[PDB]
Design a protein around this motif. Structure first.
Motif, short mmCIF file in Angstrom:
data_model
loop_
_atom_site.label_atom_id
_atom_site.label_comp_id
_atom_site.label_asym_id
_atom_site.label_seq_id
_atom_site.Cartn_x
_atom_site.Cartn_y
_atom_site.Cartn_z
N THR B 99 0.73 -1.16 0.02
CA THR B 99 -0.07 -0.01 -0.03
C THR B 99 0.93 1.33 -0.06
N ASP B 100 0.29 2.36 -0.09
CA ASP B 100 1.19 3.80 -0.18
C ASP B 100 1.17 4.63 0.80
N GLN B 101 2.05 5.43 0.72
CA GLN B 101 2.28 6.38 1.85
C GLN B 101 2.46 7.64 1.19
N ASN B 102 2.02 8.80 1.66
CA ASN B 102 2.41 10.26 0.93
C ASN B 102 3.92 10.46 1.41
N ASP B 103 4.86 10.16 0.52
CA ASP B 103 6.11 10.31 0.86
C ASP B 103 6.83 10.82 -0.44
N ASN B 104 6.47 11.30 -1.03
CA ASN B 104 7.02 11.91 -2.54
C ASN B 104 6.22 13.10 -2.68
N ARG B 105 6.78 14.40 -2.23
CA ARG B 105 6.54 15.48 -2.60
C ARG B 105 6.59 15.70 -4.14
N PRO B 106 5.49 16.74 -4.67
CA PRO B 106 5.49 16.56 -5.94
C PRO B 106 6.61 17.38 -6.76
N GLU B 107 6.63 17.40 -8.06
CA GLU B 107 7.90 18.34 -8.61
C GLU B 107 7.46 19.01 -10.08
N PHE B 108 7.69 20.44 -10.41
CA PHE B 108 7.30 20.91 -11.25
C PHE B 108 8.25 20.38 -12.46
N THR B 109 7.55 19.96 -13.47
CA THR B 109 8.13 19.63 -14.79
C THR B 109 9.46 20.58 -15.41
N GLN B 110 9.24 21.64 -14.88
CA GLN B 110 10.03 22.69 -15.32
C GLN B 110 10.53 23.45 -14.07
N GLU B 111 11.79 23.58 -14.34
CA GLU B 111 12.81 24.47 -13.15
C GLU B 111 11.75 25.89 -13.38
N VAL B 112 11.77 26.31 -14.42
CA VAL B 112 11.16 27.56 -14.88
C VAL B 112 10.27 27.42 -15.92
N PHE B 113 9.11 28.14 -15.87
CA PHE B 113 8.08 28.18 -16.93
C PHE B 113 8.02 29.48 -17.62
N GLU B 114 8.04 29.48 -18.85
CA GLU B 114 7.96 30.91 -19.65
C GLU B 114 6.52 31.02 -19.81
N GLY B 115 6.14 32.45 -19.98
CA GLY B 115 4.83 32.79 -20.56
C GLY B 115 4.70 34.13 -20.99
N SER B 116 3.58 34.37 -21.68
CA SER B 116 3.48 35.64 -22.56
C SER B 116 2.02 35.92 -22.59
N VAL B 117 1.60 37.27 -22.24
CA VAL B 117 0.59 37.91 -22.32
C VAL B 117 0.45 39.26 -22.86
N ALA B 118 -0.55 39.52 -23.55
CA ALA B 118 -0.96 40.86 -24.10
C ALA B 118 -1.00 41.95 -23.21
N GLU B 119 -0.60 43.19 -23.45
CA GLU B 119 -0.69 44.32 -22.62
C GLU B 119 -2.06 44.63 -22.56
N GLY B 120 -2.60 45.04 -21.26
CA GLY B 120 -4.08 45.26 -21.32
C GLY B 120 -5.07 44.00 -21.76
N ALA B 121 -4.92 42.94 -21.40
CA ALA B 121 -5.72 41.70 -21.47
C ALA B 121 -6.85 41.86 -20.58
N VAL B 122 -7.75 41.11 -20.91
CA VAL B 122 -8.95 41.17 -19.99
C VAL B 122 -8.98 40.39 -18.64
N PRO B 123 -9.38 40.92 -17.47
CA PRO B 123 -9.16 40.04 -16.40
C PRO B 123 -10.10 38.74 -16.55
N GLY B 124 -9.23 37.61 -16.35
CA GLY B 124 -10.28 36.26 -16.66
C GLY B 124 -9.46 35.76 -18.06
N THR B 125 -8.52 36.41 -18.70
CA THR B 125 -7.90 35.93 -19.77
C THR B 125 -6.73 35.06 -19.39
N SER B 126 -6.68 33.83 -20.17
CA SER B 126 -5.65 32.81 -19.81
C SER B 126 -4.21 33.05 -20.33
N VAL B 127 -2.88 33.05 -19.53
CA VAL B 127 -1.82 33.44 -19.88
C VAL B 127 -0.89 32.15 -20.26
#
Ligand code: MAN
Ligand code: MAN
Ligand code: MAN
Ligand code: MAN
Ligand code: MAN
Ligand code: MAN
Ligand code: MAN
Ligand code: MAN
Ligand code: MAN
Ligand code: MAN
Ligand code: MAN
Ligand code: MAN
Ligand code: MAN
Ligand code: MAN
Ligand code: MAN
Ligand code: MAN
Ligand code: MAN
Ligand code: MAN
Ligand code: CA
Ligand code: CA
Ligand code: CA
Ligand code: CA
Ligand code: CA
Ligand code: CA
Ligand code: CA
Ligand code: CA
Ligand code: CA
Ligand code: CA
Ligand code: CA
Ligand code: CA
Ligand code: CA
Ligand code: CA
Ligand code: CA
Ligand code: CA
Ligand code: CA
Ligand code: CA
Ligand code: CA
Ligand code: CA
Ligand code: CA
Ligand code: CA
Ligand code: CA
Ligand code: CA
Ligand code: MN
Ligand code: MN
Lengths: 440, 532
Positions: B99-127
């Protein structure tokens, strides 16, 4: 083939029900939907429902707190049946062994045991047997380990510890010395059985010892000084009856008295026991002739038909016995006087002085000599000092009155005391000649 | 067969090892002494000796603490063998699920994630979308249930938290508004992954979102008001350079300036954009006029190369174009003056007044006419009033330089402006024909025969134009009859034919048109002995 080790569930397992035992499985459970079931007694048979299986999973469960006294091992049996009704597995035997618990206090075979012992019992000697039984298993636990103790003797005298029970056989014995029947003849004991080798559950009962009789009590006079008297020349005469008190059981050999005169050289006293009271009847075995002994100060001791037990220290009485001088007849000495006298003896002259002895030694007694049997009147005895004188003419040729040349005449010396005791003496007057005559 | 259910041991159990799992039995254990053994991965096959079995009791037991991530399931087998070596039973599969035990903290597939959004995009818009992954049992526990959370935004403005993350989706989107490429062109996020639905083991990575450009800034005239002077008939002359400043991405269409004159009805001015400086150089597309418009005050707006975003309110500056009046040459009215005048016109007689206008409307201009071209000098002009009187005799038939019916003069009118400007008219002086000429015979030195004469045509000449010419009439006052005969050869008096009447000399011959006589003395014709 491959099976399941025997299961154990403690007796009286109490908590929440039902409890799991072990689940079973058929490898055919993926071939088809299988449906489990358990049978045997405890399951479907009495006690039905104590154990159960989950048809779906095959989990075996127990429903209630078990009791091995009741039933200590169930034999169950499991089945696997497909959903289409075909039986898949040959049934597997499942054995549940219920384990033990000290849930059964011990108990005596009897409410009240009774026994007896000798009064003079030798410490460590054995009296009685007390017993009890526990219903758990002494084969596997100390829950049927019974340990007898004693917790009370009545009466708690002379000691409080007269007896003891053998811890683990139940045999009661004498611990100390002092069992006197004469004192405390029954002892009531509360005896206790305890399981867990005495540590566990205690159950009490009773055991009664009547300590019985043992000739352990000498007969006693009261007092040690008796006093009485005997007509000196009497026989079978009661002198005195003497009193004693044997403390033992009455009427028992160990009680009835045997008396004995210790100082009786002449075998002239006999003291017989009076059955009903065992008093000492002091008699005479031979008539006591006074003149030799004026008084007898003798002792008499007591015993019992049954020989004394251990050291013997017997009781003794003193009967200061007085004999009383009875007037006896005086005794002509000799009783057969033979004298030769010339037939031609002078008339009025003295022949001889025939006398008598005085037996009763009163320094104050006298004697009277007379004569009755003078056939032919020739004699005349002096009444005072026994002197004999002829008062008629004697003749040896005088026939008839002269038997055979001898003439017999009876003389008397009567007594001067109590009763008139007349002694009798005999004179043979032998006349030798001084024709009917004798040669020459 | 009656198997044994699957045993489950909780991985990483911490207790006193080894620990008993189950206990097996072969019913044959009493018909012979049996010896229990297990085999397999964890038994005899690696991992080794993890699980063991006591040979006499047949007790399964474990030795280590198990690890589910490592080995999640054990498959084992039980063996019964009598004390005589004969395998008493068939091997029994024994299955062990860790059986299992919570003994493995998760881990982000990337050390650093890049992203881009347009200036003055609508609140609720997905980045963008981040992610982590847990090694624990997600099929059976929340040990693998991750909850993405944002730890810290850099920078904390305009607002403390511009973006939010979709708890269990990893998506990061624009929470509120104020995202300015012009203030803060990139944001950095510390995003978090905690399991047990977010309450468990947390771990953390970076997220970097650059705010992109949009034409959100209008171009603004640095100076609002301008001024410039330009000459009057030159084209595309710099009058001004328009200065503008646009806060958007340099050298992008959302930045490039575009210049438009509003006061642009006739399209006199053009303003182009200096590729690099983006300044607005103001030329003229057409020659301005001073005498028409003194000075132009035009508004020029600058909008941007690409459409604005939204509230669009374009900036305008105001350039005053002072036009420069330039001295323009005077215009004769008309430029081509025509006047009929007879060929008779007296010497000093004035033909006409030919005058030029002054195009320049600064009242300092003095138009001074001088004559430019007359090849006959028939002409003379007043430098003041540009009146042209004659100075000699004019002839309509002076064929040399009266090519056609007209004589053609050139007048010019100078002035005294800043530079010297001069106009030019052309006196088309037509000289009406006047009968000042008289007829003559063509062959003057003509030649005859003394024996058999052939007939002789004599052409008549007359410079004038009808009706001063054609109906020619000729006679001979001087002789004739003495062998002379003239016939007007042509039905219409072109010429005639003369010939001997009988079988040298000089003949006088009269001619005329509309009664302009001229007896022509020259008729020197030698008569010679030929045959014809
Ligand atoms: C004491 O022991 C005697 C044997 O000497 C038994 O007769 C009696 O029952 C008690 O156990
Ligand atoms: C056990 O002992 C008790 C005394 O505690 C008695 O009352 C009872 O009769 C039994 O002998
Ligand atoms: C009393 O009796 C004892 C025996 O019982 C004798 O030994 C003693 O002399 C006394 O007479
Ligand atoms: C006579 O009595 C005396 C006591 O007066 C004892 O000493 C003796 O034994 C006998 O009974
Ligand atoms: C990381 O995010 C990726 C998608 O970008 C998933 O495939 C994965 O499950 C984890 O959440
Ligand atoms: C205008 O033209 C005239 C000659 O036709 C000049 O005199 C003057 O200087 C200007 O060029
Ligand atoms: C108590 O003792 C008796 C002996 O008298 C046994 O017969 C009984 O079984 C119990 O142990
Ligand atoms: C008779 O004689 C005898 C002699 O032995 C005396 O003993 C007795 O006293 C009596 O006188
Ligand atoms: C002896 O004999 C005499 C006779 O003289 C009696 O008197 C006496 O009673 C005793 O028997
Ligand atoms: C002497 O003895 C005789 C008998 O022998 C009696 O008759 C007489 O009374 C006396 O006692
Ligand atoms: C004297 O002797 C005679 C015998 O002849 C007795 O009869 C008498 O009693 C006495 O002893
Ligand atoms: C949110 O959604 C947009 C498009 O709808 C994606 O571009 C972005 O990566 C995030 O998943
Ligand atoms: C997540 O944040 C932690 C601080 O808790 C950093 O140590 C790590 O570098 C990561 O950015
Ligand atoms: C500058 O002003 C002009 C009007 O003079 C507008 O057309 C332009 O939009 C800007 O606002
Ligand atoms: C030029 O100046 C005018 C004022 O007449 C403004 O309306 C315009 O915005 C520009 O600045
Ligand atoms: C020539 O110039 C004069 C000015 O003196 C005008 O009157 C005339 O119409 C023509 O334009
Ligand atoms: C008018 O034209 C003449 C030539 O025909 C020039 O001489 C004068 O300068 C003006 O341009
Ligand atoms: C007047 O007109 C003539 C044409 O006949 C031109 O040659 C001259 O330049 C002026 O304009
Ligand atoms: Ca019970
Ligand atoms: Ca029990
Ligand atoms: Ca018990
Ligand atoms: Ca006693
Ligand atoms: Ca006794
Ligand atoms: Ca006795
Ligand atoms: Ca006597
Ligand atoms: Ca006497
Ligand atoms: Ca006497
Ligand atoms: Ca005689
Ligand atoms: Ca005689
Ligand atoms: Ca004689
Ligand atoms: Ca692990
Ligand atoms: Ca795990
Ligand atoms: Ca985890
Ligand atoms: Ca902005
Ligand atoms: Ca922008
Ligand atoms: Ca812009
Ligand atoms: Ca102009
Ligand atoms: Ca001018
Ligand atoms: Ca001008
Ligand atoms: Ca002419
Ligand atoms: Ca003419
Ligand atoms: Ca003419
Ligand atoms: Mn249990
Ligand atoms: Mn375990």
């Amino acid at each position: 083939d491959w099976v399941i080790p025997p299961i154990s569930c403690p007796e009286n397992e109490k908590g929440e029900f039902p409890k799991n035992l072990v689940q079973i499985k058929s490898n055919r459970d993926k071939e088809t939907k299988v449906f489990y079931s358990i049978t045997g007694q405890g399951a479907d048979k009495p006690p039905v429902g104590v154990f159960i299986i989950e048809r779906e999973t095959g989990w075996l469960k127990v429903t209630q707190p078990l009791d091995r006294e009741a039933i200590a091992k169930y034999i169950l049996y499991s089945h696997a049946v497909s959903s289409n009704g075909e039986a898949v597995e040959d049934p597997m035997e499942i054995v549940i062994t219920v384990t033990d618990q000290n849930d059964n206090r011990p108990e005596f075979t009897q409410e009240v045991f009774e026994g007896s012992v000798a009064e003079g019992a030798v410490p460590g000697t054995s009296v009685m047997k007390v017993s009890a039984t526990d219903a758990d298993d002494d084969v596997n636990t100390y829950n049927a380990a019974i340990a007898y103790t004693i917790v009370s003797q009545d009466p708690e005298l002379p000691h409080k510890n007269m007896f003891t029970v053998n811890r683990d056989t139940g045999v009661i014995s004498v611990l100390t010395s002092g069992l006197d029947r004469e004192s405390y003849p029954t002892y009531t004991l509360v005896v206790q059985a305890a399981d867990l080798q005495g540590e566990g559950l205690s159950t009490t009962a009773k055991a009664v010892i009547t300590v019985k009789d043992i000739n352990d009590n000498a007969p006693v006079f009261n007092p040690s000084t008796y006093q009485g008297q005997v007509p000196e020349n009497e026989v079978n005469a009661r002198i005195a009856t003497l009193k004693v008190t044997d403390d033992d059981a009455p009427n028992t050999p160990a009680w009835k008295a045997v008396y004995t005169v210790v100082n009786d050289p002449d075998q002239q006293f006999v003291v017989v026991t009076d059955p009903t009271t065992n008093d000492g009847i002091l008699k005479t075995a031979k008539g006591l002739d006074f003149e030799a002994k004026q008084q007898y100060i003798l002792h008499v001791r007591v015993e019992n038909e049954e020989p004394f037990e251990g050291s013997l220290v017997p009781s003794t009485a003193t009967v200061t016995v007085d004999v009383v001088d009875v007037n006896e007849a005086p005794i002509f000495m000799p009783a057969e006087r033979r004298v030769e006298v010339p037939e031609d003896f002078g008339v009025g002259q003295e022949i001889t002085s025939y006398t008598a002895r005085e037996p009763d030694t009163f320094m104050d007694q006298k004697i009277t000599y007379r004569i009755w049997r003078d056939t032919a009147n020739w004699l005349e005895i002096n009444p005072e000092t026994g002197a004999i004188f002829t008062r008629a003419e004697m003749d040896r040729e005088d026939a008839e009155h002269v038997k055979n040349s001898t003439y017999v005449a009876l003389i008397i010396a009567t007594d001067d005391g109590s009763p008139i005791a007349t002694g009798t003496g005999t004179l043979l007057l032998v006349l030798l000649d001084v024709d009917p005559d004798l040669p020459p």
